[PDB]
A paper describes a structure:
The 26S proteasome unfolds and degrades hundreds of proteins to maintain proteostasis, regulate cellular processes and generate peptides with second messenger functions. It consists of a 20S core particle (CP) capped by one or two 19S regulatory particles (RPs) that gate access to the CP proteolytic chamber. The redox-active thioredoxin (TRX)-like protein TXNL1 is expressed in many cell types and was proposed as a nearly stoichiometric component of the human 26S proteasome. It uses its C-terminal PITH (proteasome-interacting TRX) domain for binding, while potentially reducing disulfide bonds with its N-terminal TRX domain but how it binds and is regulated remained unclear.
In both datasets, 30 s and 2 min after substrate addition, we observed non-substrate-engaged proteasomes in the RS conformation, with Rpt3 at the top of the staircase, Rpt2 at the bottom and Rpt6 as the seam subunit bound to ADP, while all other subunits were ATP bound. Instead, the PITH domain adopted an ensemble of conformations between Rpn2 and Rpn10, whose classification resulted in RS.1 and RS.2 states, with minor lid movement and no changes for the ATPase motor. Local refinement of the PITH domain and 3D variability analyses for both RS.1 and RS.2 allowed us to separate two major PITH domain states that we term forward (49.8 % of particles) and backward (40.5% of particles) according to the PITH domain rotation, along with a smaller number of particles showing the PITH domain in intermediate positions. Thus, in the absence of C-terminal tail binding to Rpn11, the PITH domain appears to form a ‘blurry’ interaction with the RS proteasome, using just a few contact points on Rpn2 and Rpn10’s VWA domain to swivel between forward and backward positions by ~91°. The backward conformation uses overlapping sites on Rpn2 and Rpn10 but distinct contact points on the PITH domain and again no C-terminal tail. The backward conformation appears compatible with deubiquitination. Indeed, for a proteasome conformation similar to the EA2 or EB states, which were previously proposed to reflect substrate deubiquitination, we observed TXNL1 at low resolution in the backward orientation and, in addition, detected a low-resolution density bound to Rpn11 that may represent copurified ubiquitin or a UBL domain of the FAT10 substrate. The backward conformation of TXNL1 is, hence, exclusively found in RS proteasomes, whereas the forward conformation is populated in both RS and actively degrading proteasomes, with the latter showing additional interactions of TXNL1’s C-terminal tail with Rpn11’s catalytic groove and active-site Zn2+.
Author numbering:
A (entry chain D): 71 to 140
B (entry chain U): 478 to 749
C (entry chain V): 487 to 527
D (entry chain b): 2 to 190
E (entry chain u): 120 to 270
F (entry chain Z): 4 to 289
G (entry chain c): 23 to 312
H (entry chain a): 283 to 376
């Protein structure tokens, strides 16, 4: 069921996704992202995201509704 | 059918069985559910092959699920308190591809092993609860643990405590119901301590089962006997009077009040 | 590796408490109810 | 009547003969154009399909409530090969079992214009099988009736049994046109 | 047999029509045992109908055929059919039971089970032998009867 | 040949299974025949959809058989209207093995698709092999002087799924498919399946040779030619050169396994260090 | 005779794949089709098979049902053993959840006039992932009955309230103009074993040995990768000793973890070499000249 | 005729069996190798010819029976390791 | 392991919860009021969470 839960959380990554810019990691599961809409949001990060790729000034795909880093 | 079976429990009268079997064979969803359930009630504990062959044979031929739900309870009741004499039927039901027939095997395990504490039967129920394709069978697998351990009420809040926090809400619901069935009337503080967080479960029906189970555990119980009765008594009122609470969580709370003050505070639930 | 892994001890912490709190999980339901009761109307 | 018919047209080498004016291939094309048209007005829901009776049977057009497509297929039918009447009826019977509407009645139209080179036992057993499925095969014994008048006699007699005129064995002697004798035959009645 | 019994006395023997019958061996042979057999003539297919009083319950049949391959292989069973049944309405319809016989069931020391739930109140039974254990154009049946009880 | 590989999608398998079940319900059928629809990509076929067509064959004679080709055209226009990129790429039949009249049916199928591919989809759940066996009609020009005939040449088959088709399959296989087994265990199970598959293939050849020896079938002289090549290709693993090379290569991989295991153990020790520090720190504050 | 909340819609394995394939291919058009099956009883709706209606033209919305396409497809499906009536219609919602719009409500009313138990199934091929398909079955709520103060359906069971309604659906008229029918899937042993052949590798691949030149180069390259990772791994051990527990994870964001990559390289290399060794050993005796 | 283990024909055997001069053996192998009748190589220093492949030929029933007997040993070896890997890796087998 | 699975399923619902704005505090006010500047949307007077 852990594999099923990991597989089924990927629906949060379904297109379309608004493109943001990773700014700062507040903690493990939350971060500050700058959406291309022009607004800075304090959102959550999907746990299955490689945090080694969260370099500064890295383009990140955000949920079109909740702006979460997916 | 429900009235006739309720009035012919264990009587094993052929005329009642023949009439009820005719109603079951009509292949009506509404009638078959009551006819199938009453079929087991009338032949309660008889363990005769003809009732098993007719009901199990019908369950593998009918295409209406409501009939299966009544038959699943009916098949279990025929082999009630039969100890190992239901082993042959149990493996046949638990190996069935029909989810409802598998649910009947869990119920058959409960009735063949009522209060016997048979760890072999408990071994099968726990295996199905954690490893089964259908959530209903998992919920019934945990539920059947109450009927096997009610003679040793302290044993349930140890086996089912971890299942009370499982990912599957259906196993969590059955975990509530297992405590309610096994610890009915005893006012088990260890069991009540398990149900107390379950009344705040995110899933609605898990809350309903915990509320109903809490009523079963501490029916008639007073403040001195059970310190948490007053807390839960206000908990039932809060859920009912909460306009933003889910309706089926209120269904358990309203039922819980009925069981808690059942019989005008003069009755208790005791399987023994 | 097998010996080291078997020697790892998890303290008996109160599991399933790092999940959503009952009070805070209720907060979304009330707020999301107004979301459906207002945006749709 | 609400029945589905299949025309077992023959394109054997003997269809080049001029015994029927202008050609047996051309004469049978007029025969189909009239018998197929007759089945259309008997019931607008009637189904007509084409099956060739060459060396190897070939279903040119399955059952359809259309007439024009039958003749266009018959236009391209050229004389070739030898008749295979044993397999022609079965392949036509097989299409009858898979018709558009199962309420239709069995009916097969055979254009026997070449000798049937089989034993009487095989022809008789074919009739019994068609009688089992209530299949009526209507055959015109044109062409070589001087030698087919006995093999086909056992075919219809066994199919019709003792009662009921389910199938007919109308036999047109050579003349101007076999179609001119079809409108007076019980096939079109 | 365990409280049930063979039911040829109930079978009226007057409303029984065995289509695709053969003049050589008729339907009487397979209903009386005493050796002999029933066989078909036109085709391997063999349609059988059996009539009796309305109250009759079927548990099992014993369609024992010969061993050469003329014994039935795939059989279709139909119950309570209004109007007549041709070979197509026995081939293009949904049977109550369509048990595919094995060689063990054909053996004279063999009894085949039926889904007793679907055979409770039977007015008449239609039996459609579709194929035999081979490619024999005639299908033979040594013996046959229904084991059960009246309703 | 014209086809290098045929990819049969799970939708086709379910459609073929359902097609065999529904017609098989009304009457016992030796097989059911339908039409395969799909696209073409380079030289690999992409069979992705199928529809049923009326079909019947007399068991006694292979020559007598009927396929409703007018139905075949009518149903194609349906599927072309919905999906224009799916064209007729062959036919299918659920018969466990090939039939003698299959080459005749392919000719009727060949006029709609010149390079028609027959895929035999076995409804019975075989334990080892794939349910699909793709064939193509080719001209086998014999060297014995016998006239050229139309024979089916086998084309490798593979079951692949579209992204959305795969999504539904995993939903239907969610409970029974056990993904907890690691990659290393999966490959070893593949090796066990490879041993079983090779063994079954070898028994099929042995069964054929047994019947040939007793005269049940005559000598093909193409299988025997092929069989001599098979046994000639059997390597001699007892050569000194191969044994030394095998030993040299085996030791090369062992040290890499040794290095990886050496790194694994200390990394495991690091994890145990962190666990004991976390446990000691947690109990100190409590 | 109020409809029961415990009503279930059973979708076959074949039906689910067809709507998923048709819906995905028609993204983002709300591609529609008809669901064939049988109303078993007042509590069950079986969807044996579905077929896709063609798109008349451009436009991301549900078009009108084409009667000639429907009738002559239904007639021609009856010939091949599919005499199943239309029990409703399905259409795709490519990514924006499963609900009914204004056009969908009008389309469903056309089916409700003919069959009162018609079911509107909405499938989300975009949001559907492996092991979890976003599907929902809807039937319209009559405005006359609900306005006067009557629940759309009776609740005699717990079955219909096991799935919590999504906020997106509740926004778009769920429980106001239409209700959701719980969807259960009918799967048999036969179809389930058949689907297990997906991605089933050929028996030749199991005994096939990887090229030893590339295998050694892969052995070479990955071991060289651990040479740098081990050097970085040593630095990571000292750094984390003198480093505060608030940066146990924040400082790991945007910087590679040598320990994580070392495990992946070890895990990759261990299965690569063990499988190659075992396959080589098995082939030594299986393919032997003696 | 010779088994695959002993397919190293010396120049004398080819010369004697073909009634040709030992110096003409080398040209004979070229024709067989060039046309494609046999596959292999020539070791002139050791005067040996290393044939590795021959054109398949028509075989009698007895030779086919011997071929089938070879499959009996081949099938036994494959089955033996199939049980060996299954038994040894039973716990990790999926 | 159960907590990991339970947290994973709850994360999918959590990730659908709308994100939070990022603002700059101008000054604090009485009654737990704070004057902030949402990045594109100017100034606001906002509450303060009880935590
Ligand atoms: Zn829509």
């Amino acid at each position: 069921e852990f594999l099923h839960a990991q597989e089924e959380v990927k629906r949060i990554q379904s297109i379309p996704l608004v493109i943001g810019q990773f700014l700062e990691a507040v903690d493990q599961n939350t971060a500050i992202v700058g959406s291309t809409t022009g607004s800075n949001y304090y959102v959550r990060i999907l746990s299955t995201i490689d945090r080694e790729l969260l370099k500064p000034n890295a383009s990140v795909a955000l949920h079109k509704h909740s702006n979460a880093l997916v | 059918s429900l009235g006739l079976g309720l009035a012919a429990m264990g009587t094993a009268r052929q005329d009642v069985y023949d009439l009820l079997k005719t109603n079951l064979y009509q292949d009506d969803a509404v009638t078959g559910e009551a006819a199938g359930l009453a079929l087991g009630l009338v032949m309660l504990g008889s363990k005769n092959a003809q009732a098993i062959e007719d009901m199990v044979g019908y369950a593998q031929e009918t295409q209406h699920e409501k009939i299966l739900r009544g038959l699943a309870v009916g098949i279990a009741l025929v082999m009630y308190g039969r100890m190992e004499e239901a082993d042959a039927l149990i493996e046949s039901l638990c190996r069935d591809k029909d989810p409802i027939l598998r649910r009947s095997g869990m119920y058959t395990v409960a009735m063949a092993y009522c209060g016997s504490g048979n760890n072999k039967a408990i071994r099968r129920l726990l295996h199905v609860a954690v490893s089964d394709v259908n959530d209903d069978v998992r919920r019934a697998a945990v539920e059947s643990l109450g009927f096997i351990l009610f003679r040793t009420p302290e044993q349930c809040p140890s086996v089912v405590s971890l299942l009370s926090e499982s990912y599957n809400p259906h196993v969590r619901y059955g975990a509530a119901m297992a405590l309610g069935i096994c610890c009915a009337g005893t006012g088990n503080k260890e069991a009540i301590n398990l149900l107390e967080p379950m009344t705040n479960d995110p899933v609605n029906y898990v809350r309903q089962g915990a509320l109903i189970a809490s009523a079963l555990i501490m029916i008639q119980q007073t403040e001195i006997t059970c310190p948490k009765v007053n807390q839960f008594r206000q908990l039932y009122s809060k859920v009912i009077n909460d306009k933003h609470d889910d309706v089926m969580a209120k269904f358990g709370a309203i039922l819980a009040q009925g069981i808690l003050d059942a019989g005008g505070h003069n009755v208790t639930i005791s399987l023994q | 590796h097998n010996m080291s892994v078997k020697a790892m001890r998890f303290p008996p912490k109160s599991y399933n408490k790092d999940l959503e709190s009952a009070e805070e999980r209720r907060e979304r339901e009330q707020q999301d109810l107004e979301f459906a009761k207002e945006m749709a109307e | 009547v609400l029945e589905s018919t299949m025309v077992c047209v023959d394109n054997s080498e003997y269809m080049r003969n001029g015994d029927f004016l202008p050609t047996r291939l051309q004469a049978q094309q007029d025969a189909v154009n009239i018998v197929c048209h007759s089945k259309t007005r008997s019931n607008p829901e009637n189904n007509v399909g084409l099956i060739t009776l060459a060396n190897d049977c070939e279903v040119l057009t399955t059952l359809t409530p259309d007439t024009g497509r039958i003749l266009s297929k018959l236009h391209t039918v050229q004389p070739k090969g030898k008749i295979t009447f044993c397999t022609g009826i079965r392949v036509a019977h097989l299409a009858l079992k898979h018709r558009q509407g199962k309420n239709h009645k069995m009916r097969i139209i055979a254009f026997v214009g070449s000798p049937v080179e089989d034993n009487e036992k095989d022809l008789v057993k074919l009739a019994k099988r068609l009688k089992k499925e209530k299949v009526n095969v209507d055959i015109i014994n044109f062409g070589e009736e001087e030698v087919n008048t006995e093999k086909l006699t056992a075919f219809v007699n066994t199919l019709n049994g003792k009662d009921g005129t389910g199938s007919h064995l109308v036999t047109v002697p050579p003349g101007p046109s076999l179609a001119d004798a079809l409108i007076s035959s019980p096939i079109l009645a | 047999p365990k409280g049930y019994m063979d039911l040829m006395p109930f079978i009226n023997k007057a409303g029984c029509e065995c289509l695709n019958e053969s003049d050589e061996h008729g339907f009487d042979n397979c209903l009386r045992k005493d050796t002999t057999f029933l066989e078909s003539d036109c085709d391997e297919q063999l349609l059988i109908t059996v009539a009796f009083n309305q109250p009759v319950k079927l548990y099992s049949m014993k369609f024992q055929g010969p061993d050469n391959g003329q014994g039935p292989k795939y059989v279709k069973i139909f119950i309570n059919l209004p109007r007549s049944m041709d070979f197509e309405e026995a081939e293009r319809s949904e049977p109550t039971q369509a048990l595919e016989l094995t060689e063990d069931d054909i053996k004279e020391d063999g009894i085949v089970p039926l889904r007793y739930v679907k055979f409770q109140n039977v007015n008449s039974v239609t039996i459609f032998v579709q194929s035999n254990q081979g490619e024999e154009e005639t299908t033979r049946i040594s013996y046959f009867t229904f084991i059960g009880t009246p309703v | 040949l014209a086809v290098q590989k045929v990819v049969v999608h799970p939708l086709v398998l379910l459609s073929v299974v359902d097609h065999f079940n529904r017609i098989g319900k009304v009457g016992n059928q030796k097989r059911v025949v339908g039409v395969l629809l799909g696209s073409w990509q380079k030289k690999v076929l992409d069979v992705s959809n199928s529809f049923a067509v009326p079909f019947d064959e007399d068991d006694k004679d292979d020559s007598v058989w009927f396929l409703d080709h007018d139905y075949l055209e009518n149903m194609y226009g349906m599927f072309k209207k919905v999906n224009a990129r799916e064209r007729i790429v062959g036919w299918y039949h659920t018969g466990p093995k090939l039939h003698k009249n299959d080459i005749a049916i392919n000719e009727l199928m060949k006029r709609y698709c010149p390079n028609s591919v027959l895929v035999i989809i076995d409804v019975k759940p075989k334990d080892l092999g794939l349910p699909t066996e793709a064939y193509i009609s080719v001209e086998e020009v014999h060297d014995d002087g016998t006239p050229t005939s139309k024979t089916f040449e086998h084309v490798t088959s593979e079951i692949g799924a579209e992204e959305a088709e795969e999504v539904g399959v995993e939903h239907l296989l969610r409970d029974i498919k056990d993904t907890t087994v690691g990659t290393l265990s999966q490959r070893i199970t593949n090796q066990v399946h490879g041993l079983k598959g090779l063994n079954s293939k070898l028994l099929d050849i042995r069964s054929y040779l047994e019947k040939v020896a007793t005269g049940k079938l005559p000598i093909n002289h193409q299988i025997i030619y092929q069989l001599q090549d098979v046994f000639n290709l059997l390597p001699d693993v007892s050569l000194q050169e191969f044994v030394k090379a095998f030993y040299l290569k085996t030791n090369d991989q062992m040290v890499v396994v040794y290095l990886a295991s050496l790194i694994r153990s200390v990394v495991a020790l690091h994890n145990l260090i962190n666990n004991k520090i976390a446990n000691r720190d947690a109990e100190k504050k409590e | 005779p109020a409809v029961d909340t415990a009503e279930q819609v059973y979708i076959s394995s074949l039906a689910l794949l067809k709507m998923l394939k048709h819906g995905r291919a028609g993204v983002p058009m709300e591609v529609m089709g008809l669901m064939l099956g049988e109303f078993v009883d007042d509590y069950t709706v079986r969807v044996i098979d579905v077929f896709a209606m063609p798109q008349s033209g451009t436009g991301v919305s549900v078009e009108a049902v084409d009667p000639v396409f429907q009738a002559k497809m239904l007639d021609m499906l009856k010939q091949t053993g599919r005499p199943e009536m239309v029990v409703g219609w399905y259409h795709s919602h490519p990514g924006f959840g499963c609900w009914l719009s204004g056009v969908d409500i009008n389309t469903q009313q056309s089916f409700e006039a003919l069959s009162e138990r018609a079911v509107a199934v909405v499938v989300d091929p975009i949001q559907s992932v492996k092991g979890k398909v976003v599907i929902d079955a809807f039937r319209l709520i009559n405005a006359n009955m609900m306005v006067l103060g009557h629940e759309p359906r009776q609740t005699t069971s717990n079955l219909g309230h096991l799935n919590k309604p999504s906020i997106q659906a509740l926004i778009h008229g769920l429980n106001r103009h239409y209700y959701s029918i719980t969807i259960n899937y009918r799967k048999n042993e036969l179809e389930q074993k058949m689907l297990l052949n997906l991605h089933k590798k050929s028996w030749m691949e199991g005994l096939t040995l990887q090229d030893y030149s590339e295998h050694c180069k892969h052995n070479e390259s990955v071991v060289k990768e651990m040479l740098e990772l081990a050097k970085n791994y040593n630095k990571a051990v000292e750094e984390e000793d003198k480093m505060t527990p608030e940066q146990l994870a924040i400082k790991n964001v945007g910087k590679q973890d040598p320990k994580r990559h070392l495990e992946e390289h070890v895990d990759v290399l261990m299965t690569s070499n063990i499988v190659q060794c075992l396959a080589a050993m098995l082939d030594t005796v299986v393919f032997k000249l003696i | 005729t010779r088994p695959a283990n002993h397919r190293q024909l010396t120049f004398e055997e080819i010369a004697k069996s073909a009634k040709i001069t030992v110096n003409e053996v080398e040209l004979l192998v070229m024709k067989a190798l060039s046309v494609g009748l046999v596959k292999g190589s020539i070791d002139e220093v050791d005067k040996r010819v290393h044939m590795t492949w021959v054109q398949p030929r028509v075989l009698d029933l007895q030779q086919i029976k011997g071929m089938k007997d070879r499959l009996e040993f081949w099938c036994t070896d494959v089955k033996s390791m199939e049980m060996l890997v299954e038994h040894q890796a039973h716990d990790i087998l999926t | 392991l159960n907590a990991k699975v339970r947290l994973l399923r709850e994360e999918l619902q959590l990730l659908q919860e709308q994100g939070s704005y990022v603002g700059e505090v101008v000054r604090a006010m009485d009654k737990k009021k704070v004057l902030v500047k949402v990045h594109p949307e100017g100034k606001f007077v906002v509450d303060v969470d009880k935590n």
